[PDB]
Design a protein around this ligand. Structure first.
Ligand SMILES: *[C@@H]1O[C@H](CO)[C@@H](O[C@@H]2O[C@H](CO)[C@@H](O)[C@H](O)[C@H]2NC(C)=O)[C@H](O)[C@H]1NC(C)=O
Ligand SMILES: *[C@@H]1O[C@H](CO)[C@@H](O[C@@H]2O[C@H](CO)[C@@H](O)[C@H](O)[C@H]2NC(C)=O)[C@H](O)[C@H]1NC(C)=O
Ligand SMILES: *[C@@H]1O[C@H](CO)[C@@H](O[C@@H]2O[C@H](CO)[C@@H](O)[C@H](O)[C@H]2NC(C)=O)[C@H](O)[C@H]1NC(C)=O
Ligand SMILES: *[C@@H]1O[C@H](CO)[C@@H](O[C@@H]2O[C@H](CO)[C@@H](O)[C@H](O)[C@H]2NC(C)=O)[C@H](O)[C@H]1NC(C)=O
Ligand SMILES: *[C@@H]1O[C@H](CO)[C@@H](O[C@@H]2O[C@H](CO)[C@@H](O)[C@H](O)[C@H]2NC(C)=O)[C@H](O)[C@H]1NC(C)=O
Ligand SMILES: *[C@@H]1O[C@H](CO)[C@@H](O[C@@H]2O[C@H](CO)[C@@H](O)[C@H](O)[C@H]2NC(C)=O)[C@H](O)[C@H]1NC(C)=O
Ligand SMILES: *[C@@H]1O[C@H](CO)[C@@H](O)[C@H](O)[C@H]1NC(C)=O
Ligand SMILES: *[C@@H]1O[C@H](CO)[C@@H](O)[C@H](O)[C@H]1NC(C)=O
Ligand SMILES: *[C@@H]1O[C@H](CO)[C@@H](O)[C@H](O)[C@H]1NC(C)=O
Ligand SMILES: *[C@@H]1O[C@H](CO)[C@@H](O)[C@H](O)[C@H]1NC(C)=O
Ligand SMILES: *[C@@H]1O[C@H](CO)[C@@H](O)[C@H](O)[C@H]1NC(C)=O
Lengths: 68, 404, 184
């Protein structure tokens, strides 16, 4: 953290550079914090941006109501 | 006889800047003999590293608790019409690449060795996304999104329910919906102008940032202190004096630096505890003011609380409390009960009101006279027990039905 | 473990220091050792004070939670349980307390057509506590947390003004429960 690995599977983050992890475009609920948005996990060891949750879009209308 | 929709700001700090300090680099630097002498002191550096890591994970936990209140990220509908209400200042702007609201952008702009400043686990982009999801949930789905599944509800009926939560009927809201929307838009514009024009409104976050920076500067400047020795540089005493005296001087410098760093750690722990309390309070306000309506007085702003808006801030959170403020009062003659055929009549929900000649019943928080009938009144006992009863007749809506 | 620290002295044991070094000259070393031990003790005391303050705040929070949503109802949402709160059961815990919150969570929602009010005989009708809903051809009033369709009558609705100032009102008749008694 705090330095670039170019002057030390290499990935660069805002917090720092990490080795031994592969960047994955998928978004998962992480467990091991890293910092600056990236949050690694074990599946091998992978690093990815943490997922906030499942995307939802309620069908809002001015004349529709939902009653359980 | 009138109301006023007033929007007030409430800024509460969320978390401080996470910092990590290296004991050997800060105290001894590049001297191997100094490190060997420091290794006999025990595990002070390990203790302080553990304390700083605990502080950092405490800040991360506070941020997660105050911001990740829901697990579903809601999205605003493309048609941003809510019965004349304007929410452009709080919704994220697609023109800005940061996906931040103009209010959020204004709050962001208004806020300006051996030590490493660890960046927060949650960046500002996902914090802004959390705030946008909370706004979408509290606007489109009402307050039920925080209590299970989200149920779609239009804004006028949500506002009617919120008015009912403070004992105000929906008829006055539906009779003055345009006036309420115009007053809300004017209040939003006025509070935006006030936030733009008042530099002292950001006092708490600026004070926290200044305190952290000043603590860091003091810890940096503490290296220049001689601590009663000949020199404040370890190189001079290592290459200028005999080891029998150089060992004593090195011990004096390292114990002075250790005392300074212990004081810094204690101050950081006290500030972290204060930030913990403030973040717990902010999380409580988010759970009560944002995720629902709170009947508590002065918990969610001045006066009666209707709803609120959560807004992201640098190292803090900004709340936009929507309040209910009565205005334009009028004197009116009252009576505890009405006597009719030897029976004492009491109001079901309001109070008896008189303008001088006739007697009506109206709500406590608004003026809405109505004919005193048997539907909105209940009888209990006779008239010689109550004190202050006046004489009036009680109309019966059932009577003209069988009169004809 | 901090008792076995040299603290800049020749050894962590003091009787050997007094035996091998005379107390006139060993007084400085003994003073350094005891002041290092006292500094460690003061650090431990300060850490214990901070932890005790935090745990006292947590205990005050637990006491307030037990005051609100154990000895009575709680209207504060997301205070001591996710969702609508019903009750809680306090059980003993090692150096602490645990809560078993019983919560109310709605499920199985359905789509309905709503209306702010009902205009009958030129007068607007507002529900007392429910909301006007429609399943496609008929209008009903239901609770805000459960589905229970009922016919719109005058007992559960009240009249306030006419039906043109409001926006979004629809047309539907209101059944009068009083009428059929004197119709016959
Ligand atoms: C309650 O107050 C509001 C504003 O304080 C009044 O609305 C004003 O009404 C006058 C006349 O209709 C207009 O000229 C103003 O432009 C309105 N102001 C705003 C901000 O819309 C309202 O009339 C008051 N209610 C009563 C019953 O008098
Ligand atoms: C809601 O508020 C926004 C922001 O004030 C309004 O956008 C302004 O519209 C006027 C013209 O009506 C422009 O002159 C301003 O430049 C706009 N503001 C900005 C920041 O671009 C908007 O009209 C309001 N109403 C609705 C329905 O969105
Ligand atoms: C108190 O309010 C009542 C209700 O509005 C007033 O009664 C009406 O007053 C107007 C104004 O002169 C008359 O045109 C109506 O015929 C009155 N209604 C009835 C049923 O008589 C009353 O005048 C008000 N009293 C005072 C002192 O302001
Ligand atoms: C309201 O009406 C009652 C009943 O007509 C009045 O009570 C009477 O008061 C007089 C003296 O004031 C007594 O002699 C009667 O015996 C009372 N009658 C009853 C049934 O109690 C009462 O005074 C009236 N109040 C006002 C303010 O005029
Ligand atoms: C909406 O609900 C009402 C009442 O639940 C339905 O009215 C009844 O519908 C059943 C069969 O659908 C008929 O057998 C009854 O005779 C109806 N009642 C009356 C009083 O006519 C209504 O059909 C429902 N509408 C939709 C579109 O589902
Ligand atoms: C509800 O009923 C009213 C009264 O019958 C309707 O108002 C009439 O609407 C027609 C055309 O829509 C006009 O030509 C009349 O002049 C209106 N009369 C009055 C007294 O306003 C209203 O349109 C109906 N609404 C719905 C949705 O059916
Ligand atoms: C990568 O290295 C370059 C040059 O060494 C430096 O300018 C840059 O800041 C580094 N990247 C990060 C993210 O620090
Ligand atoms: C009501 O009357 C009192 C005294 O007669 C007066 O001081 C007060 O201003 C009046 N209130 C209003 C709203 O006029
Ligand atoms: C109101 O107060 C005055 C003076 O204190 C008293 O004479 C009068 O009886 C009181 N009225 C009531 C209804 O208590
Ligand atoms: C209600 O309708 C909308 C769009 O018509 C749909 O997205 C939603 O899933 C529906 N909800 C239910 C409970 O049927
Ligand atoms: C709902 O919104 C649409 C589009 O803004 C509008 O055409 C329609 O009239 C609205 N419905 C009501 C009941 O206001």
């Amino acid at each position: 953290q705090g330095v670039n690995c170019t002057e030390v599977n290499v990935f660069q983050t805002r917090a720092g550079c990490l080795i031994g992890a592969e960047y994955v475009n998928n978004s998962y609920e992480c467990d091991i914090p890293i910092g600056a948005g990236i949050c690694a996990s074990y599946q091998s060891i992978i690093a990815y941006t943490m997922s906030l949750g499942a995307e939802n879009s309620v069908a809002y209308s001015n004349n529709s109501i939902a009653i359980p | 006889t009138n109301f006023t929709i007033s929007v007030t700001t409430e800024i509460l700090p969320v978390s401080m800047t996470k910092t990590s300090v290296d004991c050997t680099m800060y105290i001894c630097g590049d001297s191997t003999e100094c490190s060997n002498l420091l290794l006999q002191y025990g595990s002070f550096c390990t203790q302080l590293k553990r304390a700083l890591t605990g502080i950092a994970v405490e800040q991360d936990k506070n941020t997660q608790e105050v911001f990740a209140q829901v697990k579903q990220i809601y999205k605003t509908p493309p048609i941003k019409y809510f019965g004349g209400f304007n929410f452009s200042q709080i919704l994220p702007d697609p023109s800005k690449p940061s996906k931040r609201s103009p209010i959020e952008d204004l709050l962001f702009n208004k806020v300006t060795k051996g030590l490493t400043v660890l960046p927060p686990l949650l960046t500002d982009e996902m914090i802004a996304q959390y705030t946008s999801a909370l706004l979408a949930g509290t606007i489109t789905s009402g307050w039920t999104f925080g209590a299970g599944p989200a149920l779609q509800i239009p804004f006028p009926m949500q506002m009617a329910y919120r008015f009912n939560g403070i004992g105000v009927t929906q008829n006055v809201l539906y009779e003055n919906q345009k006036l309420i929307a115009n007053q809300f838009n004017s209040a939003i514009g006025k509070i935006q102008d006030s936030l733009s024009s008042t530099p002292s409104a950001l006092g708490k976050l600026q004070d926290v940032v200044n305190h952290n920076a000043q603590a860091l500067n003091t810890l940096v400047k503490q290296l220049s202190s001689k601590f009663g020795a000949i020199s404040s540089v370890l190189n001079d005493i290592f290459s200028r004096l005999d080891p029998p005296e150089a060992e004593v001087q090195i011990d004096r410098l390292i114990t002075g630096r250790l005392q300074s760093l212990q004081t810094y750690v204690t101050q950081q722990l006290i500030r972290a505890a204060e930030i913990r309390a403030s973040a717990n309070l902010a999380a409580t306000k988010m759970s009560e003011c944002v995720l629902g309506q709170s009947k508590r007085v002065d918990f969610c702003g001045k006066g009666y609380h209707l709803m609120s808006f959560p807004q992201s801030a640098p190292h803090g959170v900004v709340f936009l409390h929507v309040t209910y403020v009565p205005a334009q009062e009028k004197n009116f003659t009252t009576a505890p009960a009405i006597c009719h055929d030897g029976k004492a009549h009491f109001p079901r929900e309001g109070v008896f009101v008189s303008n001088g000649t006739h007697w009506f019943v109206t709500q406590r928080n608004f003026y809405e006279p109505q004919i005193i009938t048997t539907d909105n009144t209940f009888v209990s006992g006779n008239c010689d027990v109550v004190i202050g009863i006046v004489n009036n007749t009680v109309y019966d809506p059932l009577q003209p039905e069988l009169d004809s």
